[PDB]
């Protein structure tokens, strides 16, 4: 076992090849499948796993009732092999959690699970499944984290947490973690910015996080930092607006775009110099569709001009959260960090007539070979028997 | 593989971080989950497992009928990874048993499973799943043991067994076990004491057991011993009374507290010099709630004064048995033996209107970092379909 | 990996300690559990497994209909860890089979699965799951084998097969198998003997098989042989008659006891010089109860006098087949081959009002420490929903 | 780990011994079993696995509705151990796919999964579960592949893909793949030939593929090639016609036999000089029965004369696709490549009155020891509850 280096740059990619699909909701009609949301993928140097927040309940059972609710003492962070349905028969228990992150440093898994009251939640950090640290809410207002993988470089792993309002100014901290122990943290000085649910990836020994402004931004905020937590902040400048909801595409801003800026969805993007690969919903107003868009000047430039779109989920189909995950050279044998992404396909409440909310997932990896657009949606027929 | 040393002292702890939650009863509404009681956790130098006594039946099936009953030829000791629901698809078979213990010496698992008639029960000891010894009832009155992990030091493991009445004087024996073979035993000379269901942990090469006085004590008895089975006995002196039922807190005794002393619940406590960490129910009269209390003078002093309470399960929620488990330095990389605990959350009979009784579990580990009180209860909605 | 020696003698045993119980039928009321019969246990130098003949169907499903029937193209030999219920989620596939045997030589598993028409059945031999030999019926009348483990000594494994009538003289062959290849066979010259379903175990470099005379013997036939297949034959002489059905105990014979001799049940016994440990049903007329009896002169002497009985299953409870299995020194660390046994607890047809027949299992290992009699029966409540 | 050589010739075989049977459809009546079709087997140097295209749904659940349909975004390539039922609790996720292939080079698994639109489908190649290449449709008309294992020789693996009409001339390409990367491809110049769903096996360092002519041939086309993709083409000359549908046996042709040539079924055959082992349906008009036929002159000669038939599935029972798989010397310890085959037993639509279509499987391996004909059919009773 050797620590992941994380010093190479992101692989160049022309399109996105399909990597996995679990069909969780379709299978959970009959099989014993957890009610989940906030899924994400992360890889060790030997496998990729799907992590997820269960609701302590199965699909099509009465305890799925009320699962629109975000935070309870029943929620647990669990994981299973990528592409398999999350069941009690194939899932590893990770942590008690209603917000989470996880990543592998090359030697062992770090998991981060936040539970406890809204006014005093505690993140429990584990390394190889042993508790190695805790951090308690410093603003007493829903201490919360990425809902996607943390990022590792040279034996350290990194994450972002938020505490305070989700509809106004809050407080955002970056953490350096070594063998599950917090060895440094910094509070970002980011007045008028809003960071939620960051998608963070390593690139050339530094971390780049693309997050969600749930306050007053329909473009996405970003924070980038090196191993010592020296950080910079901005918003993606492209007029191909990344959040949901958002306005129609038009001239962008390098600061938060107020139009349709309140609310949001977890997302990601990958920076390539001045260019950006953006994943987003197809609808400007709800969690429908998914597409990947290459804007060669979109990280730093404000026009609404792009060079490539690839369809992922059709406009009339349900999408949800999305996030980055990477495959490092130690896993792939490549000379670059391979970028991949996942999409959560949310079914049930609030859009559909059910007692429950749950999701399935799809994922893709970036390649420089031929790809195609299509739609790979959830495919379950709702409502279910229990509804 | 190397034997666990067990020579370091208990880690200092300021609070209890949440470690696991299985949601067994909620999941067993639909999934194939064993009817269980008497769960406990124990760790090897590589993983922690949940051990439990099944009823040879699944939740929501007719064979769960009558599972208030303690002893039958259908009960088996099985185990699964911590935090996973106990199913026939993820559980390792250990022993035929209606009372049990288990622990790992650093090389292999010892399990102890008692079965047979009330007038002549036999404990079957296994090391790495091979039968290595038996011990038969010496009082012909329900030979029985810890219902939690045994404790290992320097290649030997240790347990306590009781035979005789549960409402009067009985007989209590301590055993030293090496590779599943009993190499020494002693009968404790403890007139007017009652020991049931001991929670035993290693600390500085000696074993400390905190047990249940089911006869006439609402504080908890203790027995401590070294590897040669030279032992001392007492009761926890604190007026923060540890058993359930019990009286309201008041001046304690270093002997059995007669008030509300009959009956009891399995529990634990950790000794730190003159101080004690006590886990107990919140109700004085039934198995409701759970809390951890630090009394800095409570091992040896009789006042009802404490310095720290942390809530675990709310007063209006069902609790049940609780027990110690430790994580040794060989597992954690620490310089001390880490104390942890589990709580059984009992659902069904006798408190609820069901044909069945079963439990889920929560667990916590001691840390010297920030923690919080909350309630993490079972969460199943009873009755079930089968009722 | 090293070949099992099989050169030590059988461990001396005073009684039988309980080793496993699966509760298959009770669990299969709800869980996904195979309809099985003809279970047996066998151990490698690392684990013990339960082998069984499935009916290609689950309990409580319509395809369990008609499972009184012995031979079909749907039956498969599968295995799972000892004490676990045989499900499609925990069972390894071994062979297509309606009669079987299996054993581990110290390096790999041999399995033997017989399938095909009654007039031309073929045994398929596999070593480490690769087909290594076949043997075809030589009498065109239900080629069939042990339904329990084969026996290994010094890199060779041994079994017995029968072809011809089950109610008259048939033909019986002994086979020596090396890495799944038949290297020698002999036809036993045994006029007026009947051998079915042999329970064969190694002892002092030789194999002893105790079988079932389904023709005209209520005591059990035996055949013993060395590695070169030089063999001797006899019947257990004790008047503690071993088969079911049988007469009440009285003076025995060293030849087949005609009284109630037609029909039978698979069984076993262990030879200790002139003495014998006999396992048998408690009823003389049906598959009810189980008990172990030590007769110190019963291998070679004809009196109905015994020195020890231990109860296993009560007289009013269903039993079924039973068989030997051993644990060699390479597994246990002992200086002798440890004798163990299993009992099949048959439920459904023909004794009960169901569409189906299936079994659960119990097992025990011989020890020289304290033991007790009891009853550990199946415990399912019939009929089931599907009936 | 060492690359498979693939330089020895095919083992000589006199008959086919039964290797596995899963009973998937029978078990899926109650258990949680995927709706599948297009199953196939492939082996590593350590195990054999069943690969299959799921429909993202379970048997006896409403999402099995409409599963006669071939191509959807819900279909996934998954695998499980040979002989086990394909469930979400025992199946490894491989790829998103509605057409597939897989094989092991001695070091790692290659999988090939085709998904996307009919007018632009993309094959995603993975080596050890990491995406290593893609190939996009070059004729924009259902890019598609073997539905059975690819073939490996000396660190390279080989497959055939088709793009264009299934009822007229299409385009056929052969690919050489090294560690999941396409290192060479060639378009076969095969005017008036039709290649679908090739069964390809290694033999003496070359690959032989026997396929399906869905255009105008009731005998089977073949293509053989060496590692550099120098290829030859023909049709099996025997008058024992291999496809379904077909005419009654009569004088054959070395070119496509037009009589009943439209449509087809995936199949295989093994070449032994001028002779051929043919597997085929028993019915000339539908997917009923299965039999193996040795024609000692049938590869190159046109008579309808044969030397050996062995029955596999009875004339009145449902069959389906069939395919080759091999076991190399590195797995078996033999000096030749062992030929084996599988049969898909298709149940449901279009032949039966159900909402769904799914299959079970049987397999056999070639031996030079005694064998027998029989019928090992699916055995499920249709319709099911959901119908
Ligand atoms: C902004 C970050 C964060 C601030 C607490 O909130 C996150 C947002 C979401 P999100 O998917 O946007 O929520 C959908 C709400 C649907 C409301 C429907 C109303 N109908 N009814 N009843 C889910 C997350 N688990 C949640 N995180 C935590 C930790 O709770
Ligand atoms: C005191 C130790 C021991 C002495 C035999 O009894 C233990 C106590 C308990 P406990 O949880 O306190 O029992 C709850 C009784 C509820 C009675 C309800 C009445 N309604 N009805 N019908 C469970 C344990 N398995 C049991 N051990 C064994 C070996 O049987
Ligand atoms: C004697 C050896 C052998 C000779 C073929 O027969 C064995 C005997 C039995 P056994 O348990 O004794 O059978 C119970 C019969 C119950 C009949 C009930 C009648 N009611 N109805 N319908 C099971 C075995 N699988 C069977 N072996 C094979 C290979 O078929
Ligand atoms: C010829 C190769 C290929 C050309 C696209 O078609 C293959 C043929 C079959 P096949 O088993 O022959 O199809 C059975 C059709 C039954 C029709 C019943 C009509 N009733 N209704 N509604 C299955 C395969 N998945 C399919 N491959 C792909 C990639 O779709
Ligand atoms: C990353 O570090 C490795 C190991 O020293 C080195 O070979 C490589 O050049 C670095 N890569 C980049 C892209 O900087
Ligand atoms: C869901 O919860 C509501 C409100 O507590 C209740 O009225 C309803 O019956 C529940 N439904 C189910 C299926 O449990
Ligand atoms: C990586 O960490 C090592 C060891 O802590 C440190 O000495 C070094 O500066 C770091 N290397 C890089 C390339 O950032
Ligand atoms: C326990 O033993 C180890 C190994 O000899 C030693 O380093 C350590 O000091 C001991 N610890 C204590 C706390 O006594
Ligand atoms: C439970 O057992 C009782 C008493 O034997 C019986 O009357 C009742 O019907 C049973 N219930 C179920 C669901 O089996
Ligand atoms: C531990 O056991 C060893 C070996 O049996 C013994 O010699 C020694 O006294 C013990 N050590 C301690 C530290 O108790
Ligand atoms: C069996 O063989 C071993 C190894 O040579 C030897 O030590 C032993 O004496 C033999 N045992 C008996 C009981 O013959
Ligand atoms: C069992 O089979 C019989 C006879 O074929 C049939 O009449 C009966 O309905 C079947 N029962 C079930 C539950 O399938
Ligand atoms: C065991 O097998 C070996 C090797 O085939 C042989 O030489 C020897 O005679 C046998 N030994 C015993 C103790 O039977
Ligand atoms: C295949 O290669 C091996 C290894 O060099 C060699 O021993 C063998 O003769 C070859 N086999 C054939 C049948 O050509
Ligand atoms: C199957 O689909 C058809 C057509 O969409 C529908 O009318 C029918 O009810 C469905 N059946 C089930 C069991 O879902
Ligand atoms: C096998 O591959 C090697 C290495 O690429 C090559 O040098 C050789 O020609 C090939 N050998 C055979 C026997 O085809
Ligand atoms: Ca926003
Ligand atoms: Ca008490
Ligand atoms: Ca008889
Ligand atoms: Ca054709």
XYZ file of N, CA, C and O in Angstrom, chain A residues 112-115 121-125 133-137 143 145 161 182, chain B residues 370:
76
model
N -16.441 10.365 6.819
C -16.912 11.482 7.603
C -18.437 11.441 7.639
O -19.082 11.562 6.610
N -18.989 11.283 8.834
C -20.433 11.144 9.052
C -20.899 12.126 10.113
O -20.405 12.115 11.255
N -21.847 12.974 9.744
C -22.354 13.978 10.649
C -23.716 13.547 11.156
O -24.598 13.215 10.394
N -23.864 13.525 12.472
C -25.151 13.241 13.080
C -25.336 14.126 14.308
O -24.487 14.972 14.611
N -24.470 19.524 15.815
C -24.112 18.295 15.129
C -22.598 18.051 15.206
O -21.785 18.985 15.337
N -22.217 16.772 15.202
C -20.838 16.372 15.327
C -20.469 15.473 14.142
O -21.176 14.505 13.829
N -19.391 15.822 13.461
C -18.808 14.961 12.429
C -17.887 13.966 13.069
O -16.966 14.350 13.810
N -18.097 12.691 12.765
C -17.251 11.624 13.256
C -16.389 11.153 12.103
O -16.904 10.738 11.072
N -15.079 11.228 12.289
C -14.131 10.854 11.284
C -13.615 9.503 11.655
O -13.232 9.295 12.831
N -11.212 11.126 14.872
C -11.415 12.517 15.265
C -12.914 12.806 15.252
O -13.731 12.031 14.738
N -13.256 13.903 15.901
C -14.586 14.523 15.766
C -14.403 16.029 15.584
O -13.393 16.602 16.029
N -15.370 16.653 14.926
C -15.454 18.110 14.880
C -16.931 18.455 15.123
O -17.843 17.838 14.541
N -17.162 19.377 16.053
C -18.499 19.827 16.413
C -18.842 21.159 15.738
O -17.955 21.982 15.426
N -20.118 21.331 15.444
C -20.667 22.537 14.856
C -20.124 23.781 15.582
O -20.125 23.818 16.829
N -24.318 21.825 10.922
C -22.990 21.435 10.414
C -23.163 20.344 9.340
O -23.864 19.369 9.557
N -21.630 18.751 5.146
C -20.461 18.589 4.260
C -20.861 18.216 2.823
O -21.981 18.476 2.392
N -16.628 21.988 4.922
C -17.846 21.906 5.706
C -18.444 23.285 5.847
O -17.700 24.290 5.911
N -7.659 15.543 12.068
C -7.630 16.862 11.476
C -6.338 17.459 11.911
O -6.114 17.579 13.122
N -14.629 16.627 20.734
C -15.975 17.148 21.007
C -17.050 16.115 20.671
O -16.948 15.435 19.643
